[PDB]
CSV table of C-alpha atoms in Angstrom, one decimal:
chain,number,residue,atom,x,y,z
A,1,UNK,CA,0.2,0.1,0.0
A,2,UNK,CA,1.2,3.4,-0.7
A,3,UNK,CA,-0.2,4.9,1.5
A,4,UNK,CA,-3.2,4.9,4.8
A,5,UNK,CA,-7.2,4.4,4.5
A,6,UNK,CA,-9.2,8.0,4.8
A,9,UNK,CA,-14.8,8.9,0.7
A,10,UNK,CA,-15.2,12.2,-0.7
A,11,UNK,CA,-11.1,13.0,-0.1
A,12,UNK,CA,-9.9,9.4,-1.9
A,13,UNK,CA,-9.0,11.0,-5.2
A,14,UNK,CA,-8.3,14.3,-3.5
A,15,UNK,CA,-5.6,11.7,-1.9
A,16,UNK,CA,-4.3,9.7,-4.7
A,17,UNK,CA,-4.3,12.9,-6.4
A,18,UNK,CA,-1.9,14.1,-3.9
A,19,UNK,CA,0.9,11.2,-4.1
A,20,UNK,CA,0.0,10.5,-8.2
A,21,UNK,CA,-1.0,13.5,-10.1
A,22,UNK,CA,0.9,15.6,-11.7
A,23,UNK,CA,1.9,18.8,-10.2
A,24,UNK,CA,-0.6,21.0,-11.4
A,25,UNK,CA,-2.8,18.4,-9.9
A,26,UNK,CA,-1.1,18.2,-6.0
A,27,UNK,CA,-1.1,21.6,-5.8
A,28,UNK,CA,-5.1,21.8,-6.3
A,29,UNK,CA,-5.3,18.5,-4.1
A,30,UNK,CA,-3.4,19.9,-1.6
A,31,UNK,CA,-4.9,23.2,-1.6
A,32,UNK,CA,-8.2,21.3,-1.2
A,33,UNK,CA,-6.9,19.4,1.7
A,34,UNK,CA,-6.3,22.1,3.7
A,35,UNK,CA,-9.9,23.1,3.9
A,36,UNK,CA,-11.4,19.7,4.6
A,37,UNK,CA,-10.4,20.0,8.7
A,38,UNK,CA,-8.6,17.4,11.2
A,39,UNK,CA,-8.4,14.0,8.2
A,40,UNK,CA,-7.6,16.8,5.6
A,41,UNK,CA,-4.5,18.2,7.2
A,42,UNK,CA,-3.8,14.4,8.3
A,43,UNK,CA,-3.5,13.3,4.9
A,44,UNK,CA,-1.0,16.5,4.4
A,45,UNK,CA,1.1,14.9,7.5
A,46,UNK,CA,1.1,11.7,5.4
A,47,UNK,CA,2.2,12.8,2.5
A,48,UNK,CA,5.3,14.2,3.8
A,49,UNK,CA,6.2,11.4,5.4
A,50,UNK,CA,5.8,9.1,2.6
A,51,UNK,CA,6.5,11.7,-0.2
A,52,UNK,CA,10.1,11.3,0.9
A,53,UNK,CA,11.0,8.0,-0.8
A,54,UNK,CA,10.0,9.9,-4.2
A,55,UNK,CA,12.9,9.3,-6.6
A,56,UNK,CA,14.0,11.3,-8.8
A,57,UNK,CA,13.6,14.5,-7.0
A,58,UNK,CA,10.2,15.9,-7.4
A,59,UNK,CA,9.6,19.6,-7.7
A,60,UNK,CA,10.2,21.3,-4.7
A,61,UNK,CA,7.2,23.1,-4.1
A,62,UNK,CA,5.4,20.3,-3.7
A,63,UNK,CA,6.7,19.2,-0.5
A,64,UNK,CA,7.6,23.5,0.4
A,65,UNK,CA,3.7,24.1,-0.7
A,66,UNK,CA,2.2,20.5,1.7
A,67,UNK,CA,4.5,22.4,4.4
A,68,UNK,CA,3.5,25.9,4.5
A,69,UNK,CA,-0.1,24.2,4.4
A,70,UNK,CA,0.9,22.5,7.2
A,71,UNK,CA,2.6,25.4,8.9
A,72,UNK,CA,-0.3,27.8,8.9
A,73,UNK,CA,-2.8,24.7,10.4
A,74,UNK,CA,-4.2,25.8,13.2
A,75,UNK,CA,-4.1,22.4,14.8
A,76,UNK,CA,-2.3,21.8,17.7
A,77,UNK,CA,-1.4,18.1,16.5
A,78,UNK,CA,-0.2,19.6,13.1
A,79,UNK,CA,2.1,21.7,15.0
A,80,UNK,CA,3.6,19.0,17.3
A,81,UNK,CA,4.4,16.8,14.2
A,82,UNK,CA,6.1,19.8,12.6
A,83,UNK,CA,7.8,20.8,15.7
A,84,UNK,CA,8.9,17.2,16.2
A,85,UNK,CA,10.0,15.9,12.4
A,86,UNK,CA,10.7,19.3,10.7
A,87,UNK,CA,11.7,21.7,13.2
A,88,UNK,CA,13.9,23.7,10.7
A,89,UNK,CA,11.4,23.4,7.7
A,90,UNK,CA,11.5,20.2,4.6
A,91,UNK,CA,14.4,22.0,2.5
A,92,UNK,CA,18.1,20.1,3.3
A,93,UNK,CA,20.2,23.1,4.3
A,94,UNK,CA,23.3,22.8,3.1
A,95,UNK,CA,26.5,25.4,3.3
A,96,UNK,CA,30.3,25.1,2.9
A,97,UNK,CA,31.1,27.5,4.8
A,98,UNK,CA,28.7,26.8,7.9
A,99,UNK,CA,26.5,29.9,7.3
A,100,UNK,CA,23.0,29.4,8.7
A,101,UNK,CA,19.7,29.4,6.5
A,102,UNK,CA,17.3,28.1,9.4
A,103,UNK,CA,16.2,31.9,9.6
A,104,UNK,CA,15.7,32.4,5.9
A,105,UNK,CA,13.7,29.3,5.5
A,106,UNK,CA,11.0,30.6,8.1
A,107,UNK,CA,10.7,33.8,6.5
A,108,UNK,CA,9.9,32.1,3.2
A,109,UNK,CA,6.8,29.2,4.7
A,110,UNK,CA,5.4,32.7,6.0
A,111,UNK,CA,5.9,34.1,2.6
A,112,UNK,CA,7.8,37.2,3.9
A,113,UNK,CA,9.6,38.0,0.3
A,114,UNK,CA,10.7,41.1,0.8
A,115,UNK,CA,12.8,40.2,4.2
A,116,UNK,CA,13.8,36.5,2.7
A,117,UNK,CA,15.4,38.7,-0.3
A,118,UNK,CA,17.0,41.0,2.0
A,119,UNK,CA,18.3,38.1,3.6
A,120,UNK,CA,19.4,36.6,0.4
A,121,UNK,CA,21.5,39.4,-0.4
A,122,UNK,CA,23.3,39.3,3.2
A,123,UNK,CA,23.7,35.9,3.2
A,124,UNK,CA,25.7,35.9,-0.6
A,125,UNK,CA,27.7,38.7,1.4
A,126,UNK,CA,28.5,36.6,4.3
A,127,UNK,CA,29.7,33.3,1.7
A,128,UNK,CA,31.9,36.2,0.1
A,129,UNK,CA,33.6,36.9,3.4
A,130,UNK,CA,34.2,39.9,5.7
A,131,UNK,CA,34.6,42.6,3.0
A,132,UNK,CA,31.4,41.7,1.1
A,133,UNK,CA,29.7,41.3,4.2
A,134,UNK,CA,31.3,45.0,5.5
A,135,UNK,CA,30.4,46.5,2.1
A,136,UNK,CA,26.6,45.0,1.4
A,137,UNK,CA,27.5,44.1,-2.3
A,138,UNK,CA,29.2,41.7,-4.5
A,139,UNK,CA,31.8,42.4,-7.4
A,140,UNK,CA,31.0,39.1,-10.4
A,141,UNK,CA,34.7,37.8,-9.6
A,142,UNK,CA,33.0,36.9,-5.8
A,143,UNK,CA,29.9,35.6,-7.5
A,144,UNK,CA,32.1,33.2,-9.8
A,145,UNK,CA,33.6,31.7,-6.4
A,146,UNK,CA,30.3,30.8,-4.1
A,147,UNK,CA,30.0,27.5,-2.9
A,148,UNK,CA,27.5,25.3,-5.1
A,149,UNK,CA,26.0,24.0,-1.7
A,150,UNK,CA,24.9,27.8,-0.4
A,151,UNK,CA,23.7,28.7,-3.8
A,152,UNK,CA,21.0,25.5,-3.9
A,153,UNK,CA,20.1,25.8,-0.7
A,154,UNK,CA,19.2,29.2,-1.3
A,155,UNK,CA,17.8,28.9,-5.0
A,156,UNK,CA,16.3,25.5,-3.7
A,157,UNK,CA,14.4,27.7,-0.8
A,158,UNK,CA,13.6,30.0,-3.4
A,159,UNK,CA,11.8,27.6,-5.9
A,160,UNK,CA,10.0,25.3,-2.9
A,161,UNK,CA,8.3,28.5,-1.1
A,162,UNK,CA,7.4,30.5,-4.6
A,163,UNK,CA,5.5,27.8,-6.3
A,164,UNK,CA,8.3,27.4,-8.3
A,165,UNK,CA,7.9,30.8,-9.5
A,166,UNK,CA,10.9,32.5,-8.1
A,167,UNK,CA,15.2,31.6,-7.7
A,168,UNK,CA,18.3,32.2,-9.8
A,169,UNK,CA,17.6,29.5,-11.9
A,170,UNK,CA,14.1,30.8,-13.0
A,171,UNK,CA,15.9,33.5,-14.1
A,172,UNK,CA,18.3,31.2,-16.1
A,173,UNK,CA,15.8,29.4,-17.8
A,174,UNK,CA,14.3,32.9,-18.6
A,175,UNK,CA,17.4,34.5,-20.0
A,176,UNK,CA,18.0,31.1,-21.9
A,177,UNK,CA,14.3,30.9,-23.3
A,178,UNK,CA,15.0,35.3,-23.7
A,179,UNK,CA,17.9,34.6,-26.0
A,180,UNK,CA,20.5,35.5,-23.8
A,181,UNK,CA,19.2,39.2,-24.0
A,182,UNK,CA,19.3,41.3,-21.0
A,183,UNK,CA,16.6,44.0,-22.4
A,184,UNK,CA,14.2,40.7,-23.2
A,185,UNK,CA,15.1,39.7,-19.7
A,186,UNK,CA,13.6,42.3,-17.7
A,187,UNK,CA,11.0,43.1,-19.4
A,188,UNK,CA,10.0,39.2,-19.3
A,189,UNK,CA,10.5,39.6,-14.9
A,190,UNK,CA,9.1,42.8,-14.5
A,191,UNK,CA,12.1,44.7,-13.7
A,192,UNK,CA,11.1,47.6,-16.0
A,193,UNK,CA,9.0,50.5,-15.2
A,194,UNK,CA,9.0,52.3,-18.6
A,195,UNK,CA,12.1,53.7,-19.3
A,196,UNK,CA,13.5,53.1,-15.7
A,197,UNK,CA,14.5,50.6,-13.2
A,198,UNK,CA,11.3,49.9,-10.1
A,199,UNK,CA,12.3,51.9,-7.0
A,200,UNK,CA,13.7,49.4,-4.4
A,201,UNK,CA,11.8,47.9,-2.8
A,202,UNK,CA,8.5,50.0,-3.2
A,203,UNK,CA,8.1,49.2,-6.7
A,204,UNK,CA,9.2,45.3,-6.5
A,205,UNK,CA,5.9,43.1,-6.0
A,206,UNK,CA,6.7,40.8,-2.7
A,207,UNK,CA,4.6,37.8,-3.6
A,208,UNK,CA,3.2,35.5,-6.0
A,209,UNK,CA,1.4,37.6,-7.8
A,210,UNK,CA,4.8,38.7,-9.1
A,211,UNK,CA,6.0,37.6,-12.6
A,212,UNK,CA,8.1,34.1,-13.0
A,213,UNK,CA,11.9,35.0,-11.9
A,214,UNK,CA,11.1,38.3,-10.6
A,215,UNK,CA,12.6,37.8,-7.4
A,216,UNK,CA,15.3,37.0,-6.0
A,217,UNK,CA,16.6,40.8,-6.6
A,218,UNK,CA,20.0,41.7,-8.0
A,219,UNK,CA,21.0,45.0,-8.3
A,220,UNK,CA,21.0,46.3,-12.3
A,221,UNK,CA,22.4,49.8,-11.1
A,222,UNK,CA,25.9,48.5,-11.2
A,223,UNK,CA,25.5,46.7,-14.7
A,224,UNK,CA,25.0,42.9,-15.4
A,225,UNK,CA,28.3,41.4,-14.1
A,226,UNK,CA,26.7,39.7,-10.7
A,227,UNK,CA,23.9,38.0,-12.6
A,228,UNK,CA,25.7,37.3,-15.5
A,229,UNK,CA,28.0,35.3,-13.3
A,230,UNK,CA,24.8,34.4,-10.8
A,231,UNK,CA,23.3,32.7,-14.0
A,232,UNK,CA,26.1,31.1,-15.3
A,233,UNK,CA,27.7,30.0,-11.9
A,234,UNK,CA,28.4,25.7,-12.2
A,235,UNK,CA,25.6,25.0,-9.5
A,236,UNK,CA,22.8,25.1,-12.1
A,237,UNK,CA,24.5,22.1,-14.2
A,238,UNK,CA,25.9,20.5,-10.8
């Protein structure tokens, strides 16, 4: 047996486990409105789906975890504290960097704060001089560790229904003929003839265009973003 018991929610359960991404996301959304039993099914899904291979899209478990995280049920919060105290996305670093707070901002949909912390974490990785500076040289970007960048990107993907992350910007850029002007339009980084004013003119929720976040400051030219999108993390 793939999963345990549960009739109105029987097809939803099957869809959650065995559906395509669209079906799974619709199913878990509906299950979160089906009370104690609906949430119990989502708990079991987090346990059971860990065995799936090859790796599914990280926002399936990400969004399932978010729905549970937002549940009013004491038993659900106990389950999460016992088994997912630091969330559902593995936090990996080559430089002892802590991503726990970042993960917390993400599940809560605090995207502006998560974007601030993303930048701060890249500077942390590049060392004291970058950390003090608060921005990166492109040469420093080229040298960021793969595990750290993957952790950051996996978090962005997992908590944005796959809409946000450097890997998304990379694919959009490659699909835009590697043309930066086309990219800025595609991901919503133009306000007519100028850059959007930070932070107020960016869109800090999932209504934003795919690739809108995280931000990389274009006032200093494209070299840092170019280094990010060409980093070995995305073909490792």
